[PDB]
Symmetry: C3
Subunit: 227 residues, 3 copies
């Protein structure tokens, strides 16, 4: 049920908020139109995360879904977050590597299906079908990471060393972090309740902050964002 | 009610999936950044259609709406599909003809209102109002087809013969197919139940596959997508 | 409750519709691709407003929310409207002033959070929390107006006099009008019921038409939209 994890939601709300404030108070006198895009994209990520986490702490983003043989607490707000949030992170990577519009669109579409599909899964009443949606969603994710790791790295090789290396760190961090989400989902309250909603919220919390604030820090503090 | 049409939903899911796989396995070694956009846009259409159709087969995208004087089964998932799907098809046409940003925006907006409006209609409890929404939606569609047929054809005349002719076929196919949707809606379970939900799902199924996979095949197999 | 304000909804529906028709019947023979964008963006605003207002008149966009100690009537359709509508207006201003992509993205994101946040607030069951969302939403708005008034005006100074001055009028009108929305919300049925839903709907109606049709008239009737 939703009550004991309140603390992980509260620390998450706090961390996203401060992460937003810090980024805002760092790109203020930035004139380079390129760095400007990066700060805008990167500042918005934690800001959206902030609002959704707060809706979870306040209980608004929690819903109850009947499946298996009981009433399960499903925090839907995560998808609302990730829906805009994951595409933004991808965009940062695309700008850094100067990706083709076509691949950016394919990536954004793949990302949309990933979250949309995972949302349908977390809300499906037929326990067994939830995992079908999980598989489709995970397939979409693998497609995204495949392009990031192999297609983007290649595009990064044509940029100057600062960009290429900062991209490498960002690439490694997103590939590692993103792939932890589906596993958490599968073993948490949205799938096989192996892990309690308590510990689950703590995992997502560490993953989200790292994937946003951490990712944000690595990027916004490198010279890579400058033309 | 929703059970007998299961087969049309299943074949639709299958056809969209295979259509997605085929397109994916055809634009793999494509380097031309132009063709790349077309494959990305065109591959995403059937992929989204795939997920929504599956939600209908699995019963998730079906809801019940009280109107007239009974409980009517309304597959809402179609709008979720068409919401992203119809705009994408329009974009393919715009890229092919190299449309102005302003007209692309007007077209996307008109398309958004068309599906949004039709969604409101399919879910409205006052039987008589459903048709008001239908009219507004149909008006938006007519605006889109008017621009495609007269405005776009003109823009196509300035491209090389392969583009102009492929555009012509695509234009004719979308104008004919798209206009069948409102009629089906009006005579099906969403409006006047003249046609059973059974036969309706079969019509949309033929229309959707043609309008996506068929449209996709005609486009992706022509040299028109190359610069 | 929702019944007596029906007239403000009906006049609003009428005014948005005629405002859409007028704009459509004014940008018909416009060839300048720049003016074309402005007409497209500006025509879509009242069109969307039209559909949402009609959903409110017809009772579809009204929902009931329990909070405080009673059943309150909340017209949710406003957010659906403003969600696409406010960003479009911002885009008109950005195009006029030729804003950086980064600031356009930050503005669109800030706007999304503003409406998304206000929507969550209008639907939150814990009376006290509604105002938290209100504050966050108002903070997002202030961020937008700050950039419009100080950042954009500066960008406008680099354009020719017709653009700079038309921008000034548009700037003043949006800053004044937009800031009236949060106050209305705070004293209306969504917050402290100081003002009845009757009078509230009349205020939003005057604000919406001015902010869209009025804004639209000032812009589309100046030479500022031409390159
Ligand atoms: C790219 C962009 C950023 C992505 C944004 C997508 C977003 C904008 C789309 C909005 C789309 C719009 C057209 C759809 C509107 C649907 C609306 C009418 C309602 C939908 O409701 C379903 C929702 C989830 O709601 C469910 O959970 C809540 C909370 O827990 C419940 O309150 C609600 O009731 C739930 O609804 C489901 O169950 C109801 C069930 O009642 C059941 O009745 C049956 C009868 O047999 C049984 O009795 C059931 O059993 S039982 O438990 O009691 O035992 C009983 O429960 C149903 O009535 C409801 O109909 C429903 O099934 O779904 C969310 C769907 C998401 C949004 C779909 C996303 C679609 C796709 C993946 C998008 C891909 C994006 C693509 C990548 C874009 C590409 C282009 C780019 C620009 C590049
Ligand atoms: C461009 C882009 C791709 C398009 C994406 C648009 C998408 C992102 C928007 C999300 C928008 C967001 C701000 C709105 C959130 C609304 C939220 C609070 C809930 C909304 O619910 C209404 C939904 C449908 O839900 C309905 O169906 C489900 C399933 O069947 C039901 O479970 C649900 O309850 C239904 O809700 C309606 O009825 C409820 C009724 O209870 C009633 O109470 C009355 C009391 O008098 C009576 O008792 C009724 O009678 S009775 O039957 O029992 O006899 C009883 O039923 C109400 O309480 C609910 O409030 C509701 O009325 O609506 C979907 C709306 C859609 C999304 C609107 C789209 C808006 C517009 C067309 C978009 C244009 C896009 C434009 C083109 C963009 C341009 C810019 C581009 C970038 C270019
Ligand atoms: C940028 C673009 C244009 C913006 C578009 C955003 C849009 C596309 C997003 C769609 C997102 C999707 C992933 C989320 C789907 C959620 C879905 C599953 C259902 C969500 O439901 C919640 C809705 C509102 O619904 C509520 O109102 C209706 C009508 O009045 C109700 O019918 C419905 O039931 C309500 O739901 C709430 O309450 C239910 C409660 O039941 C409760 O149970 C508890 C148990 O303890 C108590 O018993 C309660 O008490 S009591 O009253 O009876 O006494 C009892 O009520 C819950 O079950 C439900 O779960 C729910 O809490 O929420 C709308 C959320 C909005 C859309 C979030 C927006 C997110 C963020 C701000 C977006 C920022 C955008 C950013 C700027 C983009 C940046 C990138 C750009 C490209 C630049
Ligand atoms: C705890 C919180 C998380 C809770 C708050 C709720 C929150 C979720 C909602 C807030 C809205 C939020 C979504 C906003 C995100 C904004 C973020 C994306 C911005 C990124 O930033 C992008 C820049 C774009 O820059 P520019 O204007 O174009 O400048 C051009 C210059 O003139 C050089 O030109 P040249 O190249 O030709 O030489 O934003 C514009 C630059 C401006 C000119 C300068 C702006 C300065 C700021 C207004 C001040 C910084 C903020 C404050 C320290 C406090 C923040 C309070 C909070 C309530 C907003
Ligand atoms: C049955 C199914 C429908 C069910 C699955 C669920 C499904 C709904 C969800 C899946 C996600 C789906 C939304 C993904 C859609 C992707 C689609 C839009 C892609 C269109 O494709 C666009 C390209 C962009 O190309 P590039 O990377 O930029 O290459 C540049 C090159 O180096 C030349 O450069 P130069 O010009 O300078 O010379 O995608 C990138 C090109 C890559 C470099 C190569 C990628 C190869 C693929 C990973 C392999 C093809 C797929 C496999 C046969 C099987 C598919 C499995 C499925 C589970 C994903
Ligand atoms: C009461 C109503 C509110 C209720 C109706 C419901 C409503 C909510 C839904 C309707 C859909 C609505 C969303 C549509 C909005 C459209 C709006 C955004 C359009 C803005 O307009 C943008 C232009 C783009 O122009 P272009 O086609 O690219 O022209 C290029 C030219 O050849 C020069 O080229 P050069 O530069 O190289 O020299 O639209 C294309 C220009 C076309 C070529 C000309 C089009 C003309 C129109 C079809 C006729 C005008 C409309 C009618 C008077 C009546 C309207 C009826 C209503 C039902 C649609
Ligand atoms: C979602 C799933 C179902 C679908 C997966 C798609 C996959 C089957 C097809 C992938 C095809 C592409 C590689 C196309 C060929 C492109 C050609 C130019 C050949 C190059 O391909 C070679 C390498 C990239 O080059 P280098 O690493 O040497 O630098 O691909 C590296 C390829 C590596 C080895 C494969 C990617 C490995 C993923 C992580 C394995 C996914 C399978 C999981 C074990 C399934 C788990 C499900 C369980 C729960 C049932
Ligand atoms: C949605 C409805 C309500 C609104 C429709 C809008 C309509 C009334 C206005 C259209 C205006 C534009 C034509 C503006 C004039 C532009 C000028 C340059 C004149 C050119 O106009 C001439 C031609 C295009 O040129 P060519 O075909 O010769 O190459 O337009 C070809 C015009 C053709 C003849 C009209 C388009 C025909 C549509 C399909 C008919 C819609 C009416 C249906 C019969 C209503 C059904 C409703 C029932 C169920 C109540
Ligand atoms: C949402 C709230 C909580 C957060 C507000 C953010 C704010 C605290 C920080 C603003 C920081 C920026 C000004 C950053 C500094 C940039 C430097 C170059 C210095 C320039 O700053 C000077 C001027 C702009 O220049 P000119 O007017 O002289 O031409 O800013 C003009 C600054 C003016 C004076 C401030 C903007 C005034 C707003 C309207 C006041 C908001 C506070 C309300 C009274 C709170 C109401 C809440 C109640 C209900 C509890
Ligand atoms: C700030 C948030 C980030 C970086 C979120 C990333 C989320 C994912 C990669 C989620 C993936 C999921 C699946 C692959 C399948 C099951 C459900 C999800 C949505 C958890
Ligand atoms: C892949 C799907 C396609 C090409 C769908 C096209 C759909 C339309 C043109 C739908 C139009 C409708 C109306 C004009 C009015 C009534 C309701 C709709 C949504 C069925
Ligand atoms: C056509 C509509 C326009 C220009 C709408 C503008 C709306 C706003 C600026 C709304 C702002 C709000 C807040 C700042 C807080 C509380 C709730 C809102 C959504 C009313
Ligand atoms: Xe992207
Ligand atoms: Xe388009
Ligand atoms: Xe904007």
């Amino acid at each position: 049920t939703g009550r004991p994890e309140w603390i992980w939601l509260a620390l998450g709300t706090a961390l996203m908020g401060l992460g937003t404030l810090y980024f805002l108070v760092k790109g203020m006198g930035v004139s380079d139109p390129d760095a400007k895009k990066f700060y805008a994209i990167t500042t918005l990520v934690p800001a959206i995360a902030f609002t959704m986490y707060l809706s979870m702490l306040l209980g608004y983003g929690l819903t109850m879904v009947p499946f298996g043989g009981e009433q399960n607490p499903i925090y839907w707000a995560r998808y609302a977050d990730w829906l805009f949030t994951t595409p933004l992170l991808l965009l940062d990577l695309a700008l850094l590597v100067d990706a083709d519009q076509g691949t950016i669109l394919a990536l954004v579409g793949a990302d949309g299906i990933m979250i949309g599909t995972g949302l349908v899964g977390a809300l499906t009443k037929v326990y067994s079908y939830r995992f079908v949606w999980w598989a489709i969603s995970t397939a979409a994710m693998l497609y995204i990471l495949y392009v990031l790791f192999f297609g983007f790295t290649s595009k990064a090789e044509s940029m100057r060393p600062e960009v290429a290396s900062t991209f490498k760190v960002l690439r490694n961090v997103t590939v590692v972090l993103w792939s932890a989400y589906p596993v958490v989902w599968l073993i948490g309250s949205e799938g096989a309740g192996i892990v309690p909603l308590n510990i689950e919220t703590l995992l997502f919390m560490v993953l989200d902050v790292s994937a946003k604030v951490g990712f944000g820090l690595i990027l916004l503090r490198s010279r890579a964002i400058f033309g």
